[PDB]
């Protein structure tokens, strides 16, 4: 029931769709987007900023779309 029998491997967990991530690197051919703790390959067609908070729209494999999000003090 509780036990755990996954040894793991691949960083593909599928499920950065919807979570937040944040910008450690940006750059034209691809961007640096550190989601759950890992870097992903996104593109952005809106210049993002160093430090930039942004959501998963989607994820077509080891690619997923964000979309620059507004904080909540806002």
Known sequence: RRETTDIGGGKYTFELKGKVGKVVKIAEDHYL??????????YSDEK???????????????????????PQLE
């Open 33 to 42: 987007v550190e989601v759950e703790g890992d870097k992903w390959i996104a």
């Open 48 to 70: 993002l900023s160093l430090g930039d908070r942004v959501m998963v729209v989607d994820v077509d494999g080891l690619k997923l779309k964000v979309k620059r999000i507004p």
